[PDB]
Symmetry: D2
Subunit: 461 residues, 4 copies
C-alpha cells in the first residue's frame, strides 16, 4: 500500500525541511510540498519530526554471558528498540575456538528468524585467527554480508583475543573490505586487579569500576590503533567511555588513520557514583568498560560535537536485577556485565544532547542513524529519508515531557538504569519498510516481520 | 516556470540516489522516481550527478590590494564561479580605520548590484574594535545579515589588527551570534623577515615563501584559538595551509572548542617549488600563506577526510601576470598577493579528492557546499538539494577528461595556476534559483541576476 | 683567612658525600676526608649539609612599580636572601622607551653600590627594539656583562612590549649570545578582562586571579616559544605557574628547541583560594601570574622532577600590606603586584620538595643554584662546591622543625605569605666568597660586601 | 698505593675545574689545587680530562642467543670496555621458564668469575611471573643485589613475555624497590611481518628493518608506560631508537610518571641505509630494534639534550660476520641479532655529541656514567669523581683525531660497525678502584680483577 505522511518536519543528517513523504510498498518514492497522492493512507505528522529510524550497531540479544543469558531475546529486544525509535540493529554473533565461523552464524540466524520485529544485521566475533578462520572469512564477508569483525581485548578466558589475533584479523579485514571492531580494555591488567580486589575482601559492585581503570581502556585503545596503522586497516572502537581513549582516537584521526569511535548513552549521562548505590543496587550499573568520573561525559559530548566519535550504540546486554545480577552477590566478578539501554538511546541523545546544545539536531541523526549505516555497509538502503531508501521512519514529538521508568518501558528486564530521568521527546509511531511497527505508542507489528540485512564491504564515509 | 530534471543521480552531503527533481519557480518542490510532472521543461541528466551548487566562502572580487585592484569584478568573477560549479559566494567587505562599517558595506553592495550572475553574501573586515565599531556591529549582524567578521593577523600597516582588536571582536561576536574568521600568520614576524630578506638582496618570488614560515601561521592560529577559548566564542580559520596549523585546530576541537577550519585547492595540489619557476613565473604563485613543502598536502587531505577541517574556499584574489604581478619585479614584497582559484575549486576537489579516495563523494558536497552554508548562516536556503531549498544545482559529468587551461577558463586573468593539470569531471549546466546560468557549457544567465543573501546568526552545525 | 669546614656532608647537583672543605681566601682550594690543614679556622659542620649558596635569578629590589617602590632595597633584600640560604641574586634592571640602556644600567649599579651584602648580577628589560637599542645591546652584552634580556608580554602601558620587539630581541640575542626571558601572559586579554571586571563592580583581590586565566599564560608562553624557534634563539620562561604553560614548554623541548622554564615557591605551595581571604587579606597574595587552582602545583613539581622546568626563582617583589597593598582597596588593579618570597625559597624547596619525594636532594641544589649559574653565565665561579669555586656555602640543618613567620623573617615587609607554614630545615651559617655573612643565625656581614658579577654569554647547560 | 693525578681538568655531571686528584688505595681521598701529597705516584694528566669511568648498563657478554653465543666473554668484553673508557658494566642475566632465578644468577656469576677485568652488576630477565617467581624475587633484590628486572616484549618463542608477566612484574618491583627495564617492540606484530617477508621471498638483511616498523616500538613503549602508571611503578625503556618512542616517553614524563629512557650509539650515528649494503654486508648492522631513517637521530639527540632520555648504553651483543652472522645468509631471521658497540660508546658520544653541540660536556658524563649509577643503584660508589668514590677514572685526550677500525679495537669480533668513522678523543689511561687497567694505551690489568657489585634498591635521581 501507499502511505502519505503529511505536515511533518523531515530532519536528516544534512537536511531540515517541511514536506510530505510518500511511501509505496517498502520504500520512499516521493517527497514534496504538494504531491496530491492518490489512493494513499494519510498519516498526520503535524507537530512531529520525521527522523530516519535509529540504527543501533551494538546489541547483544539472547546472548549467553556472565553465567546466564541476556533477558531480551530477538523478539522482545527488537520490539523495545522499535518503541525507542530504533528500526535496525546490528547484533554480535559470538564464536568459540575450534568451532567454524559459519556454524556460529547459523546459530545467530536461528535466534532471530521468525522473531525480530525490525531489521537486523550481524557482526562476527573473532576469537583466533588461525589459517582456517582466515580462509573462512572470505565467504563470511562476501556471501553472508557480515562485514564487521569484533575482537575482544578483555574478558580473559572467556572472549579475550591477543595481539596476534587482532593484527592478523586487521590484515585480513583490509584485504576483504571488513571493518574491525574492538572492545578495548587491557584484559591482563583487569584480570590481575580483579583477583587482587577479591583477595583483599573487596567484593562490592563498586570494585567492578576500580579494577578497570580508564588507563587500561586508554592503553588497549592505543594498542588497537597502532596495529591498525601497521596493517593500514580500518578500526571501530566500540563503547569509548573516557577522555584517555578519546585523546588517542583524536590523535590517530589527525594522522589520517581510518579509526572511528562509538559511545553509548550510559557513558554520557551516568557516572561511577551509580555503582556505590547501597543494598546491591550498584549491580544494576555493572557493565564494561565501567562508568567513569563524571567529568569524562563532557569530553565524550565534545568528541561527538566535533566529529572525533561518529556513532552512538546502546551495548544493550540486559540482565534482571533479581536472580541474574544476584549471581554476583558477594563477588562483583560474577555479576553478569551489561545494561538495559536499547530503548532509551534515541530519546536520551535528543533530550540531553540536542536540547542542551551539545550536538545539533542534524548531528543527532548522523550519530544515531546515518553514520552508523555508512560505517556498517547499510547505506543508503537504511539510515536516511530519501527517495529509494527503505521507509524506516520515526514520528517523534520533541515537546512531550516524560519520566523514564521500568513501569513504562518495553525491555524484558526488571529495572531501568535511567529510572526517574526526566526527558523531552516521545517516539509516537515507527515504520519499518513502510509498515507500522509502533503506531501511537501501541505495538502493531509482529514477530518475524524483521529481515536480515546483508551488508556491503567497507567504504569510508 | 517548472523544470523536471530526469534520470540523474542526486548526491548531497548525506544522500546518494537516483531520482528526478522538480523545480517550480526558484525552489525545489518535489523529488521522486515517478513524479509525472505536467507542463514542466524536461532536462535530461542521464550520466550526470546533480550536486548542490558549490558555495565559495572565500572571494575577493573587485578588491583594492597590492597597489592595484583584483582583475575579476562581480560580473566576471561570479560568471567564472558559475562555470566552475559554484552558485553562491561570500566575499570580504574591507574596512578602513575611522570609516563607518556601514559605509564600507554600502560600497560593497555597489560593487555587486546589477553585476553578479549568481547569489552573494558579504563578510566584514574589522580593523579595530573601538566602542563605536562595537556598537555598529549590532545592526550589521541583525539587519545587514553579515554574521561573519574577518580579522587579519598579518599584512602589517595595511589590514593587520592586534590582539586587543581580535579579543574584543570575539567577545562581541559571541554576544551577537557572529562567527569570527582569521587570516592567521604572525604579521610582526613576517614584517621583520621580509625586510631582512630585501636587505640581503633576496628579492625573487621564492622569498615570498621563505619570509612566511609555517611556524608563523601555526603561532597565529594558536593565538586566535586561545583568545577564542578565553572569549567562549566561535572561530573560523581561513586558508589553513600547513600541518602546524592543522595540529592546533585538531587539539582545540578535541577540547570541544568551537573552532572550524577551511583550506583551499592551491594548498592541496600545489607546493612551494612552484615559486621557484624562473623568468618571474614564480610570481604567478605568490599568495599568502605561501605554498608549502609538498608533504603538508596529505595532512590537509587527512584533516578534511577526518572532519578536522570542514570547508574548502578558493581565496580567489586574481591579478594578471602581465602588468599587475609585474609590480613586484625586483621586489617580491610588491607582487600583489593572490591567485585565480574560483573556477577550478569544485573540479579539483572532485578529481584529486574524490577520485583518489582522499574524501568521499558525500564529503566533497559537504566541504564545498553544505557545511559552508551551515557555518555561514545560509542553510537550508542554500547548500543542499531538498524540498524548499533554492534550486541551485549543478549537472556534473564525472567521466569527462580535460586539461585545465587559461585557454578555456572564464576568469578575467591571463594565466591559470593549474595550467596543464589533467582532471576528470566537467560542469555541464548550472542553475541558480531555478534559472540556468550555464547550460551545456554556454553562459545563458545575465549580469544582475544574482541576489544578495542576508545570513542568519551563528548556529553550530 | 683559611677556613676548614669539618664533619659535614657536601651536596651538589651531582654528588653527596662526607668530606671536609678547605677555603683559602675567597675560594675553595681542597676537599678531602683528611686534609690536616694548618693555620685554618675550624668550622664544625657536624649534622649539617654543606650546600652551594642559592642563586636567585629573579629579584626586584628597590623597584618602582605599582605606584610605589618595593620595600626591600639592595641591603635589606640581600640580607634577607642570605638568611634564606641564597648567596647571589640577579635583579631586573628596568628601562623606559627613549632611555639609553647604559643610563638604566648606571641607575641599577647605584641602587646596589655600597648596599648589597652578597653578590649580584642584572638582567636588562627591553621595552622597545628600535635600531638604536639593538646597536646598544652589543655593549650591554660585551662591556656591561649583562647576558639575559627581559621582555614583558603583559602589564600594558607599563612594561609591555609587542611581538615586533620580542622577535627582534630574540634574533639580536642569538647574534650576541644572550638569553631572552619572558613574563608570558597575554597583556591585551588581561587589559580587557581587568577593565570589564571593574566595570561590573568586581573589585575585590580575588578578581586579580579571575582576570588572568591560565590560558592567557599558556597563549603567551606558546607565542614566545614559536618566536624563539623562528629565530633559532634561546628562551627562558620566568614564573611558569600552570599546567597549560608546562605542557607547551614540554612540547617545545621534545622538538629540541632551547626553551627553559623557571617556577617559584608561591606557585608550588599556595593556591588561588588564598586570594579569597576576607577583610582585604587576599591582597597579600596579589602577584602575577596569579595563584592557580591547587591541582597545578603537582604538575609544576612533576616538571621539576622530570627536567621540564630547570630553575626556581623567587620573583621577590615585596610591598607592605599596610599602606602599599592598600593602594588597591576598592580596586584590585591598583594593588601593587608582588610577594615577599626571597627569604623562604630554599627552605620551601627542601621541605615541600625534597622531604616529600617530589624532587631529589641533588635536584634541589641544581634547581636552586647550579643550573641557575649555568643558564645565567655565572658558572663555575658560582653555583657549586668544587675546587676553584667562590666559597659561597650554606651550612644547612635539615632536621630542624620550625614555623615561617613575619616575626622571625628579615625581609623589610610587614607580612610573610607563608605565615604559619611548618617546615623542616634551618639555615645556620652562610659564607659569601669565604667570608661569613650569617653565622649561627646572626648577621655578621656588611653593606657593600657584595660584588657585581659580569656574566658570560650563553652556553647550553 | 697512593696515586696523585696532576694538572688535569676534572669533569663530572655538574662540575668542570682544574685540580689534582689524590687516590689512596681504592678511593678518591682528596681533590685540590695544591695537595703537596707525599709517598704518592705522580700521574701527569696535562692536557687531559679526568672523567668518571663510563658505566655501561646494557651488555650481553657470553650470551646464548641467535643459535650461537656472543663472541666477547666476560674477559674480552670487559677489556674492550676499559679500552673504550668504561669501568663498570651491568649485564643481562637470562632465565627460562621453570628455572629457579637463583640458579640463573649462579650461572652468570660463573661467567664473570676470574674473568672480568672491571666491575660488574647483573640485571635479571623475567620470562614468567608465576607466584613462585614473584616470591623468589624478594631474595633476588634483598640477598643477590639485583635491583633491575628485564622484560622482553619481543623475540616471540625465545625471550618474549606477555602483559600478565609485565604488569605483575611492575607491581612486584614497586613493592621491592626494583626498576623494570623493557625491550619495547610488539613481538606479535614482528612475528607476523617476519614470516610474511620470508613467505614473499624477502630474505635479505634490509628486511630485518622493514619487518619491525617504528610504530611497533612506539606501541610497545606506550603499553609498558601505561602498565607502569597502572602499577605506580618505575620503568626504564632500553634502546629507544625512534621518535615515536621518544614522544611517548616525553608525554609520560610530563605527567610526572617515573619513566626513564636509554639510547645507544648505533641509533645516534647509523641509519637504516646501512642494512642495504650489498654482498651480505648489511648483516653487520642487524640488531633490534632496527636502524631507523636518519631523521630519527636528531630527535634522540634532542631528547638527551633536553633530559627526556637520561642514559646511553651499548647493547653490546657481538657476533662475528664470518660464521655467526652468516647463519642468516638467505634468511635474515637467522642472522643473530646484535652489534659490537661496547668499545666505542664513550668516544662516539663525546665526538658526535659534545663536539657538535648536541649535548654539553657535563651532560656527556651524566648520561654515560653518573645518571647510570643513580638509576641502577651503584651511586655514589660508582659514577662520579668525588671524595669517597671508587677511583674509577679515565684520562681522556679530547684533541686526538683518529679513525675507528677493527684493526685497532679490542673487541673479540671480526668487524666494527663504525669502521672508517673519524672521531676526536682518545682514552689514554683507565683506573678501576685505584689500579691501572689501561695505561698509555696498553693493557696492564688482569682477568678477575673485577668485582661483582650488589646494587641498592631504587631511588629517583
Ligand atoms: Zn564490550
Ligand atoms: Zn558489547
Ligand atoms: Zn588571507
Ligand atoms: Zn583571502
Ligand atoms: Zn613577571
Ligand atoms: Zn618578576
Ligand atoms: Zn633488546
Ligand atoms: Zn639488549
Amino acid at each position: 500500500m501507499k502511505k502519505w505522511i503529511r505536515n511533518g518536519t523531515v530532519v536528516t543528517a544534512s537536511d531540515t525541511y517541511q514536506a510530505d513523504v510518500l511511501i509505496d510498498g517498502e520504500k520512499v518514492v516521493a517527497i514534496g510540498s504538494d504531491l496530491q497522492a492518490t489512493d494513499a493512507e494519510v498519516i498526520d505528522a503535524t507537530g512531529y519530526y520525521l527522523l530516519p529510524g535509529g540504527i543501533d550497531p551494538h546489541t547483544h540479544l539472547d546472548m549467553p554471558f556472565g553465567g546466564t543469558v541476556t533477558s531480551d531475546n530477538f523478539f522482545t529486544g527488537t520490539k523495545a528498540a522499535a518503541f525507542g525509535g530504533t528500526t535496525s540493529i546490528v547484533d554480535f554473533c559470538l564464536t568459540s575456538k575450534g568451532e567454524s565461523l559459519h556454524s556460529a552464524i547459523a546459530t545467530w540466524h536461528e535466534k532471530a528468524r521468525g522473531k525480530a520485529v525490525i531489521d537486523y544485521g550481524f557482526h562476527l566475533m573473532v576469537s583466533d585467527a588461525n589459517d582456517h578462520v582466515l580462509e573462512e572469512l572470505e565467504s563470511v564477508v562476501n556471501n553472508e554480508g557480515i562485514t564487521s569483525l569484533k575482537v575482544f581485548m578483555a574478558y580473559k578466558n572467556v572472549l579475550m583475543a591477543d595481539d596476534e589475533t587482532l593484527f592478523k584479523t586487521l590484515i585480513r579485514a583490509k584485504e576483504l573490505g571488513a571493518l574491525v571492531q574492538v572492545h578495548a580494555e587491557n584484559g591482563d591488567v583487569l584480570d590481575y586487579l580483579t583477583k587482587q580486589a577479591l583477595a583483599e575482601g573487596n567484593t562490592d559492585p563498586i570494585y567492578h569500576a576500580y579494577t578497570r581503570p580508564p588507563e587500561a581502556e586508554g592503553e588497549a585503545t592505543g594498542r588497537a590503533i597502532a596495529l591498525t596503522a601497521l596493517a593500514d586497516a580500518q578500526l571501530y572502537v566500540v563503547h569509548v567511555s573516557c577522555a584517555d581513549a578519546v585523546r588517542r582516537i583524536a590523535e590517530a584521526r589527525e594522522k589520517g588513520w581510518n579509526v572511528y569511535g562509538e559511545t553509548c548513552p550510559q557513558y554520557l549521562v551516568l557516572d561511577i557514583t551509580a555503582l556505590e548505590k547501597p543494598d546491591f543496587e550498584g549491580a544494576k550499573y555493572v557493565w564494561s568498560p565501567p562508568l567513569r568520573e563524571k567529568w569524562n561525559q563532557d569530553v565524550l559530548w565534545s568528541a561527538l560535537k566535533n566529529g572525533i566519535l561518529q556513532t552512538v550504540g546502546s551495548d544493550h546486554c540486559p540482565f534482571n536485577f533479581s536472580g541474574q545480577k544476584e549471581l554476583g552477590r558477594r563477588d562483583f566478578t560474577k555479576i553478569p556485565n551489561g545494561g538495559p539501554i536499547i530503548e532509551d538511546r534515541m530519546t536520551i541523545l535528543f533530550s540531553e544532547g540536542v536540547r542542551k546544545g551539545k550536538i545539533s539536531l542534524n548531528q543527532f541523526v548522523d550519530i544515531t542513524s546515518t553514520k552508523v549505516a555508512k560505517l556498517f555497509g547499510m547505506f543508503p538502503q537504511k539510515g536516511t529519508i530519501a527517495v529509494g531508501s527503505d521507509a524506516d521512519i520515526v514520528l517523534f514529538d520533541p515537546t512531550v515531557q516524560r519520566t523514564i521508568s521500568v513501569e513504562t518501558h518495553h525491555m524484558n528486564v526488571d529495572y531501568n538504569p535511567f529510572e526517574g530521568m526526566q526527558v523531552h521527546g516521545d517516539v509516537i509511531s515507527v515504520l519499518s519498510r513502510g509498515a507500522f511497527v509502533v503506531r501511537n505508542k501501541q505495538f502493531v507489528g509482529h514477530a518475524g516481520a524483521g529481515r536480515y540485512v546483508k551488508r556491503s564491504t567497507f567504504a569510508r564515509p
